[PDB]
Amino acid sequence: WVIP
Amino acid sequence: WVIP
Amino acid sequence: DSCIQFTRHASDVLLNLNRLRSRDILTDVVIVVSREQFRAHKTVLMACSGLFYSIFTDQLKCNLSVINLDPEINPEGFCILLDFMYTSRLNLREGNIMAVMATAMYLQMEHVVDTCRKFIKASE
Amino acid sequence: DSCIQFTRHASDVLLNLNRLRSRDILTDVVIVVSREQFRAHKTVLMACSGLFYSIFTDQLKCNLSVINLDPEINPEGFCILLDFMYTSRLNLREGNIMAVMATAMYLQMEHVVDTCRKFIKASE
Ligand SMILES: O=C1Cc2cc(Nc3nc(Cl)ncc3F)ccc2N1
Ligand SMILES: O=C1Cc2cc(Nc3nc(Cl)ncc3F)ccc2N1
Ligand SMILES: [Cl-]
Ligand SMILES: [Cl-]
């Protein structure tokens, strides 16, 4: 999961 | 396009 | 094999599937979550959820155009997860995380359940 | 928005859609390319091809379960492109590049047409  |  | 691969292809496919959903093109099922209705593509739901995979591989249920979820399921939690299925983006907030995690457990979306558990653990 | 994003989601969705195709689950169209038949999902074809997008948004053609392509289309070229749609991988070879490029121009798959043009230019 990432900060888009 | 890339070499997978 | 000796194939070449277009990096952005899968993301571009998903973006186009979400554009078809927006425009209600070739949607083939309505998911009912108490008083709310959500239109979607059975194939996208099956590709994202172990529960929908089990439902639409059943010889009788595969033919249904309406699926009613358990009354305990929160419509906002379902909406957030449906948007995630079609975009890869999850609108996880302090005010919705419990409903989102409960919905993802029911829908059998293991990666979502994983990030919810981690975010909850961080607040404790 | 303040969303989080699961990097592998789009790739995992496409992998599952290809598993449904393998297993002939919820395929809803047969594409005929002379003597050969290919089963697929209309939504995946529309998401990848400008030609299929135009076909399945047509109020009459959206209801067809069989689509016959132009007799000049090569079945192997179509097969290679159908595999690309479901996997992001293109089996481009000296022996098939002309048929693949011609098929991609017909199907309106601009990124494929682009890599074919570049590979052809490199050999000249
Ligand atoms: O957490 C999750 C997400 C998820 C999706 C699916 N989907 C499919 N699985 C297979 Cl093997 N082939 C085709 C599919 F559409 C099954 C189980 C699960 N569990
Ligand atoms: O080279 C290409 C690939 C391609 C795909 C599509 N697909 C869709 N386009 C839109 Cl805007 N919304 C939903 C779709 F399924 C249209 C044109 C083109 N041309
Ligand atoms: Cl997930
Ligand atoms: Cl393309």
Verbal overview:
The complex is a heterotetramer, with two copies of chain A (4 residues) and two copies of chain C (124 residues). Helix content of chain A is 0%, strand content 0%. Chain A is elongated. Chain A has 4 residues and is mostly loops. Chain A contains no helices and no strands. Chain C is of the alpha+beta class and 124 residues long. Chain C has one domain: Potassium Channel Kv1.1, Chain A, CATH 3.30.710.10. Helix content of chain C is 53%, strand content 14%. Chain C is built from six helices and five strands; from the N terminus they run βαββααβαβαα. In chain C, strands 3-2-4 form a three-stranded mixed sheet. In chain C, a hairpin with a 2-residue loop joins strand 2 and strand 3 (36-40). In chain C, helix 2 (42-48) crosses helix 3 (50-56) and helix 5 runs antiparallel to helix 6. Chain C starts with a strand and ends with a helix. The relative contact order of chain C is 0.13. Strand 5 of chain C pairs antiparallel with strand 1 of chain D. The complex binds ligand A1ACW (2 copies) and chloride ion (2 copies). One ligand A1ACW sits between chains C (46-50, 53, 108-110) and D (16, 19-20). One chloride ion (CL) binds next to helix 6 of chain C. Chains C, D: This is B-cell lymphoma 6 protein. Chains C, D: Residues 27-94 form the BTB domain.
Annotation keywords:
heterotetramer; A: 4 residues; little secondary structure; 0% strand; elongated; C: 124 residues; alpha+beta; Potassium Channel Kv1.1, Chain A; 53% helix; 14% strand; globular; binds ligand A1ACW; binds chloride ion; B-cell lymphoma 6 protein (chains C, D); transcription; transcription factor; radiation damage
